[PDB]
Symmetry: C3
Subunit: 131 residues, 3 copies
Amino acid sequence: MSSLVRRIISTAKAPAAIGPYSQAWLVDRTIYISGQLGMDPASGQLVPGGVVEEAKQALTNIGEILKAAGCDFTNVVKATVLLADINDFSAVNDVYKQYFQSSFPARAAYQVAALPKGGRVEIEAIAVQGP
Amino acid sequence: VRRIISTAKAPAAIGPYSQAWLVDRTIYISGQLGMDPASGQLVPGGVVEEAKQALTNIGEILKAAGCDFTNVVKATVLLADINDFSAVNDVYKQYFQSSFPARAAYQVAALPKGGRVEIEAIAVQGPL
Amino acid sequence: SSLVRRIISTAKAPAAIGPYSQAWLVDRTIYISGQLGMDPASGQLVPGGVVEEAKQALTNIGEILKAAGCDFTNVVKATVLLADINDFSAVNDVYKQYFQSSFPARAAYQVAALPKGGRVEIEAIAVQGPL
């Protein structure tokens, strides 16, 4: 008796879902984004190079999903960084660094036991639509 | 639209938390293990059987808030062994038939009571 | 259409050891960053172990809530991250001293490692009162 707008997000500029989930959902004004690994949308595999290159690809994947929802990085209000080794903390912050330039979102970060597909880093996020 | 959601004749005291909270139109649900509503103990059979009970418990909480599985928008799957990824996904699909929600999944070091799987979720009420 | 959005930043909580803000208020919901048992003035962990670190982490969460016009009764969800699952009972006893009644929804588990070698970290979400 008071309907809410719900819309699915799906773009090829981002990797396909290796499991039973959707890329993102928009409900009312909030966007829930699934966890992203450092996978290349063209090859379907993790990029080589290690944790730094995987973190750059994962954040680029998040950017294409945000644009497909009519947003950019200034719309993110919270994020979670999952690491395979707590000793990569300083290096990952240096890549995370450049995408959220200032006015950083809320965040949480810790080392996990293992990630799917043997990845070294995984990142999820929540955003709110303009204005 | 701000109240604690509780199921009738059920246990929920493995510590200081509530089953779920409804605020405005969003429902925040606590992480669920494969525990028996009648026995208070983990069900036998392993990780595959524990996942079936954990999702059934989530279903009973949704019903107490006037919703079903089509109202879930996000979920997180916590595993004790990453080797169980494929098996848990096959059970997960049987509850969400199509139009899957957003999700995240990874392996943790350990779960309470020695459980093998735990699932939390968020839902939004509908005008249905 | 346009919604309210602003940042939270007060010196009664520790400064951010990385690219994140203490909390975000959007519409009526508050997203709070994960807190360790750090002393707000020195940025060092308080002495005593996991029991003392849990008390300080919850005190930090309280000061951020007040800077957003809330208290502990406004929290609807929280996550408890432990370095050792055998600390479950002791941390639960500290938890009850801050969330006394009508408990929020929760999740708890043991992670592989936390930043700065902490023994416990807690995040939460809150919603403002009607008043």
